[PDB]
Write a protein that binds this DNA or RNA. Sequence first.
RNA 1: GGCCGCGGCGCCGCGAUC
RNA 2: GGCCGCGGCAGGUUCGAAUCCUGCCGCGAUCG
RNA 3: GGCCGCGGCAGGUUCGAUCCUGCCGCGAUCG
Lengths: 436, 437, 437, 437
Amino acid sequence: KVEEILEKALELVIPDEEEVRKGREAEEELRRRLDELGVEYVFVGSYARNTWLKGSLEIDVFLLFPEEFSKEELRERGLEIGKAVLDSYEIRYAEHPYVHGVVKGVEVDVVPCYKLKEPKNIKSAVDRTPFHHKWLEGRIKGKENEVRLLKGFLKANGIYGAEYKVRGFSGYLCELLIVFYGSFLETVKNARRWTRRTVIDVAKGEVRKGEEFFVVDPVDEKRNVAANLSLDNLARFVHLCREFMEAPSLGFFKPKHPLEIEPERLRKIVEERGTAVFAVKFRKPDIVDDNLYPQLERASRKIFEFLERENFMPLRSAFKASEEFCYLLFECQIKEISRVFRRMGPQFEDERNVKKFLSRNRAFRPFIENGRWWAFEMRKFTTPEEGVRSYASTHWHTLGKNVGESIREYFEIISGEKLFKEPVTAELCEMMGVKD
Amino acid sequence: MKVEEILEKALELVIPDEEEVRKGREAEEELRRRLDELGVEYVFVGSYARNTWLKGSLEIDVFLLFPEEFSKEELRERGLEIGKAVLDSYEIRYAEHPYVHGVVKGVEVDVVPCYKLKEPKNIKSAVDRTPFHHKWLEGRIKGKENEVRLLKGFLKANGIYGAEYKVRGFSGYLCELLIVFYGSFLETVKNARRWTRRTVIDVAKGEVRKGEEFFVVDPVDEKRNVAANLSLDNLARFVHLCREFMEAPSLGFFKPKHPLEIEPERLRKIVEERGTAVFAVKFRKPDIVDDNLYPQLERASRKIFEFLERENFMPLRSAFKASEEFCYLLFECQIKEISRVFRRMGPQFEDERNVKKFLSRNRAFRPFIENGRWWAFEMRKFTTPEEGVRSYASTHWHTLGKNVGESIREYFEIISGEKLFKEPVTAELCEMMGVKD
Amino acid sequence: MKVEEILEKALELVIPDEEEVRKGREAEEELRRRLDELGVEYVFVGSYARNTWLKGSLEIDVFLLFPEEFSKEELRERGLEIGKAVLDSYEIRYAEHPYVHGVVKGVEVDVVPCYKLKEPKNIKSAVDRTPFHHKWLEGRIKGKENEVRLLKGFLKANGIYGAEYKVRGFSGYLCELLIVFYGSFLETVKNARRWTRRTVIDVAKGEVRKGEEFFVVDPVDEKRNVAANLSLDNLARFVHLCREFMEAPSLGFFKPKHPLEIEPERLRKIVEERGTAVFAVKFRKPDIVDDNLYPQLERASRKIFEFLERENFMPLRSAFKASEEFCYLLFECQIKEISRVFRRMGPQFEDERNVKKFLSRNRAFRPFIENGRWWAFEMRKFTTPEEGVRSYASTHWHTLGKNVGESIREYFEIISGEKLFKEPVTAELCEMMGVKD
Amino acid sequence: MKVEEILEKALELVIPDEEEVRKGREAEEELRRRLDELGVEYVFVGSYARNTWLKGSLEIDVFLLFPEEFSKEELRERGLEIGKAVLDSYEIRYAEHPYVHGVVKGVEVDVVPCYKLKEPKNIKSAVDRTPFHHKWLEGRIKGKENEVRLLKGFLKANGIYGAEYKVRGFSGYLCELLIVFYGSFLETVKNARRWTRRTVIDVAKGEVRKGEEFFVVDPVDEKRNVAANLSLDNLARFVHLCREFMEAPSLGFFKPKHPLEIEPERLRKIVEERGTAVFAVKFRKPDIVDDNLYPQLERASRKIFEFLERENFMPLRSAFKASEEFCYLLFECQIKEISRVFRRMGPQFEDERNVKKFLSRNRAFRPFIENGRWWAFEMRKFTTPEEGVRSYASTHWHTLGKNVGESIREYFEIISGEKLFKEPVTAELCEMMGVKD
RNA sequence: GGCCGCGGCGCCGCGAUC
RNA sequence: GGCCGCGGCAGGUUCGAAUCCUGCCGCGAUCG
RNA sequence: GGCCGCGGCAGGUUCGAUCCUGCCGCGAUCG
Ligand SMILES: Nc1nc2c(ncn2[C@@H]2O[C@H](COP(=O)(O)O)[C@@H](O)[C@H]2O)c(=O)[nH]1
Ligand SMILES: Nc1nc2c(ncn2[C@@H]2O[C@H](CO)[C@@H](O)[C@H]2O)c(=O)[nH]1
């Protein structure tokens, strides 16, 4: 039965007592250090509401300073306080330079911000986090386990987190959904009837039809909490919910193992497909995931669009970011194209331009077709691999700011059996739909 | 060298020698003698009557004029009786109505029945128009016959003389109107350089204006376009030749180009460098007139071309040739081979019902979501243009024209690779690929 | 009493009652609910969406909008797939694209797939041009829905509403464009009296001018004639009705005419008095839609009518009728019986050879000369119009329309006399002969 | 492994586990409690009472006894009332007579009213025999319950268990009589190898003899055939099964068979190799029980088959499937296409009266004499089996069964070619064509 | 799918119409 | 209620039906 | 800081512009 499955799930989902005592002792000690300095602070985030998922323990503390101190005034000051409270700290750059460190083994964040009267003086996202907490701290009580079930259900299917690496559901969005539908089970049941135009207005407690999938923030009606939830991940979630209800299982809460596959079998698969499968290798820029992945996504789309234009008929693309290198994977229906192509000339009555078009020397004679001139010309490349070698060599600049600059410094085109040796088997299996 | 020198030298290739003219006069006299014996009203029309016929293209046209009171059937009976009774060796041909083609003292002759109309307003049949055409031209073309012959020779040598569907070019009647309008061959070539696809040449009103298509107003019937069957591409070819001519005149324009005759090993080498897929569809030529066959060969080629487009084989050009026995549909494709797998479109994720059906079917690989919609990897039936066309010719033979489609249904085959170079199509392949000498 | 009062009362015959309106509103709401569950882009268009549908003719037209990237096959797959899922008791119909017709909460619904085009130039399909028609009228027709609704009822009551081949009248779209042009039903009727067979009505430019045909310019496409399939005769009828309507306004114009059925005995006496020959060609109705059948019944009757004209049976008028199981081609001729002997045309007296052949034939009677031509007395194969058609229909079945032709080849019979009046054709017979009361 | 171990292992797949028995026992004693409170005559019969129900097919049967002092109308009233006032979640099923079916503490139950009766000399309703059937078996089956279960499982695993019209196999009652007769499952299988279509098994007389048809004599009524609804073909499939089992015993005979799995492309290619015409008649499934639906599908499938034979399309076999919404009638024909023309037999040459009538019809070709009789060429309305069935389904809907025929009268569609392989009927197509894994 | 018109010599092909 | 086998009728197909295609009434059988 | 959507300029492609590419401004998202 479902009720027993969700009970079994709580084991994988709820943090153990040791993890709580580790955080509780880190919290109580973190306060003593903040009280002595006599600074205005507040505990928020998934910890303050006791909704953090198992293994993902993090303490979020916000410093509430007056409105008088503008921008860089409290930035450096709040940063200074973060050092005199944390053990092994390090400066991390978000919208505002905040401080990430550790206190008695537990990771901690210290973000400075304004102390605003109402959510009208909102400047940035950091100014909304306190209001998100204030709105949730009361309503979420007695539903902490419902949140964690949802967070686990999503993280197991790789769609938990609003960061660009995932483009899934935020922890804040999860809690809003539980407050709306009451429980995890009710959320999954109703999600089956979600569409790409569903509007979930939490504050007004109703569901409307809109222009896009829009979860209205109770703090700011103008804001979509699911703004970075991709359309596909929305589609995937709706489907996962449908599958869960038809045949409930604890498997939905356990992560999947990458498809084990021998390079020889993988070769035999590509042969059966008759496609060209290759990858663009290059060194990973030293930048944050929130900057890296949107760029890899761009570089992929750009090369993909180039392959379309050059009539190589690409099927799908993919990318992987390892420790030192990045890979842009492609699969095209055309292994090789004729050297000859057709270049369109002007209409026959346009004598001036026809003369210019015909003046160019070519191996074969131009011709007329539908009252317009045409000419046989030669391609510079006949394979998709050679085409991308050319594109990545001349159009490196449009492949993302940092990714484009790395490709400028170095890149290979790896295909055939040599590709299967690279650590990209998990993604090649995914984009081709290999099953076993 | 000089313009007038070339035009003078061109007349030799284009004017009938005095022997051919004598051959025609002798038949003409005998033909009139046999007709007068029968008490029928006739009229010598066409190229021969106006003395504007091309060298080695002698053919007499005689139209029989009957009262309007006659029925279509009576018109025919009297026509065929008088046809057979005047020609040494006749045969019944068809064109709107039956007429009699035959020979008289070596010279070929056409005897056509039509109504004797006083006003050019009672024109039901097109044959009823010919007497009016001749009537309008016999006076205005006098002195200009050599100019007409030049234009005809210029057009013929460049394969665009004749309004039949095999040529889709300039009719002889059209050539005469052009000379009457412009005054001479040279002046026609000159002004032709500024012809557009919207040019309207109205001889009867003596003006040039703009229209929706290239229109040559018939002086006999202003609603008729004399250049109706002049294709856009052949119009373009003519305008371009006229420019090429005035830029660098030459007697070569009036001579036919000997077909590109190359060996099957060089032809293999050209296709090799082009990197394309060249192949053909061989089948038996239907037993029909060219005016039926060629429009169907066109349709056949177009349909297969459109098929190759849809199937992503990326065709460059198509061509066709007709032997006395067989017919060939030629094609060149940029893709010699395509992958087995392809993307099959599924429903949007919101569809509980259809997504279930879509995912129900068995496939070698997992379907996936993209842009909020399900897609699935499926396999192609064919992976080369040759096999794709083989499949299409077998299943969609009916769309390749009536007579051509039925013939393909009985028997066809895909002659590809080097085996095709042995077939008699090399001249068409070189034209199709733009091969130089 | 006065025109304005008649119209005010005519509105009742024409506007949908509150119950029929609500019937649609409930279907619409349910239809939208189903379409939203599938995430498909759609739009309610046509007569219902603009709230101009005639009383009793409630029909909802939803158009599915797909990207231009979609292949025609994909366009059709998704369309059909969505239709069946949204309609209760669906029925696959065919036009330009295969679409789905069905029922939702007791209301008729059409679901047509098409392309979501931003440019009205990318139009290739007629279903692609519908979404543009709707948007051009959506704002303009607002506040005039009852004026359109009058024009429809006025037309339908006189059997000239609908541009199908069965009616060859005014389309619904045409009706709305005319109200937008003249402002109201009354202004449309008043000006229609001055229409001609050359009148052009430019809606976008809001001006009238002369042309070749009766042309109502589509605001979305200047090249298209909205009143293309409006027959010349139905045009004349509408003009006349408008003139008759203003000279003596009546609510009777907005009401259908009674069947006007008469006893077989009266009809027998009428034909006797007229002294004509009235017969029919009966045959099985081809299993084809009306749009294919009626143009063929028109051709069939026309061809047979022309045969009777050639054979001197002097046809007056013709008509046709399609029942459920059979089809009838009705004819009335002034000659019940013609002489067995007739004149056969021979050669002129000069033609010695052919006169010999002509006079050598065995004949009951001697040939003779008349106006320098030999004539002969020969015997007709048939001597009544029924005999003649029985022949022609069997030896020229192939010209009587494709489907109609093959059905006549399978089976047909010439019905006349008492046995014809028993067939379901009396209404058409009376209309043909101009019987009154 | 060997037979003894196979049957041992089979008991696992066959005997209900202690959890299923407990689920039933608690339901029984509870059901008895409610029958004692009202104080009504009742009896537990059927497979449950004798403890022979197959694994997973748990179903309690309880017959309500009533005195003979009741008419056929009074029994259902206080019969169903006692039924509804005993079952928790009850409904109403319709069989021989109205009866209540519902679930009681997990398991479903049937409450059938009937007369008590003294001896089987009455012989009236079918439900009046069930108590006598149980009484005859309850003593003789004790100690053989597992043998019964082995037979029932052996049959169900091969789709021939159950006397319902959807199966036309062996009834549960029949299975128990056989075990009583032969002593065990293994002895039944051994002797069944020598069964014929004329074998008579008399249980009460303990003898086998030859008769007119396969007949298992009911011990209660010698005139009744217990295996009456066992089809001839299923009897054949059983005799063959037993022979295969004894020749090479295996546990696989007790496990149901795989669903096959085949791709549309292979299925298309197969049909191409057969050179046959495969198509289906698709329509909406009438909302009726299987026992009414399947016999009608058999009738419709048969009627159309006989039509295909009669129309010389030479059908090979026919199959049918019933989904939740639609029903399919599958057919395969050796003739994809037939000539337009055919022969019709006329009268003998002496019969002048009828020769005149026969020769009066308008036909495309001349009739001819052959062996003294007159014959005539005539034209078919259709030339393919698809189109032939389309005509037949349209004009003979009424004979394709009551409910099925009515649903076809409303809507049906002929699905041929590759489009048929998309429908959910691949399993039925593979079985029909004898496609091997 | 059928119908009309155009073009070439009723047979074919192409535009318009439902 | 539906299906099946006979018995008596009533239409349709056909030049013409005891016979081929259908429908109604009566009896028997099967299944729920 | 990066990415995405708009708005306005500027190179390139090309026979010439549809396409490609860059710069500035506004808004959105993530850190
Ligand atoms: N179609 C038709 N066949 C008949 C008719 N009467 C008899 N037959 C059939 O004609 C054939 C010859 O008749 P018989 O000599 O057997 O009486 C037989 O097959 C017989 O059944 C009838 O009225 N119509
Ligand atoms: N009227 C008619 N009788 C036939 C035919 N064939 C056989 N017969 C038989 O011939 C006999 C005529 O007396 C009857 O027994 C008929 O059944 C036929 O084609 N027409």
